[PDB]
Amino acid sequence: GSAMGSTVSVSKPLLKLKLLDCLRQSNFQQLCHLIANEFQPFDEPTVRSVFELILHYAVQVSPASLIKDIVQNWTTKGSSNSQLFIDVNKQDQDGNTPLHLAAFQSRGDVVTVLMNHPDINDCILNDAHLQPIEMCKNLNIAQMMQVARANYVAEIAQEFRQAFNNRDIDHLNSILSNPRNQELLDINGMEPETGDTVLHEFVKKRDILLCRWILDHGGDPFKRDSRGKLPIDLLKKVSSKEQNDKKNAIDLELKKMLEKAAREQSVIDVT
C-alpha cells in the first residue's frame, strides 16, 4: 500500500470477532495460523489484551479438545519464554480466571484439565471476592474441586515437611514461590504428636538457618505450643554480664531474631 495511507489501527472488537469465530469452529493449527496473520504487531497493547484472554474465550465457546491443546502448548513452564504464552491464572476485567469461568459454566472436563495444571491457582478471588469453586452451579463439580484441592494440600504439605526435614532452603523457596502454596500451607500449624509448630521445633534444634527462613515466611512468634509456651520461652535466660560470651552466641542470635519477629508481628496483628 501507498505510504500516504494511514496505518490500519488495531480494533479490539474486530480482533475479538475474528478470534471467537476461530475458537467456535476451528482447531489448534488454524488458531495458530490466525494468531500469526491477524494478531500483529504481536506486542501491540490492544493485540496483547485480546491474546492474553484466549483461554477465557475458549472456556466460553470452544470444545474441550481445543482447550486441551491451548493449555498443553501455550501455558506450561516450557513455553513461558515464548511469544505464544498464556498465563493460566490470568484475570479478566471481572477478576475471573479461566477456572472461574469453567466452574461457572459447569464444564467439568475443563475444570479437571485446569485443576491438573501444575501452576494453577484455585485461590484467586474475582472482583466479587469469590474463588473459582464458589462459582459452581453444579454440586458434583464443586465436590470434585473440593477433593482435588484437599489432595493437593495433602501432597504439598508433605513436600513442605520433607523440605524442612532436609534443611533444604532452595526447595522451601521453590515451594513458596507458587502463590497457591503460600495460601494453602500454614507454616504456623501445630503438629498434634508434639504440640510444636515448626518455629518451636527449630528453635529447640538451635537451627539458626531454618529459624531465620521460617521467620521470613510468616512464622508467628506469638503462637504458643500445646503447653502454653512461646518459642522465645524455650531459650534459657542468661545474666547480663555473660550475654555476649561466645558460648551463648547461638541462643543470643535466636533471641534477637524472635524479639524482632515479635515486633513485626505486633504490627501485622493490628493492621
TrEMBL record:
Domain of life: Eukaryota
Sequence intervals crossing the membrane: none
ANK repeat copies, ranges: 94-117
Family in the record: Belongs to the OSBP family.
Protein name, as recorded: KLLA0C04147p
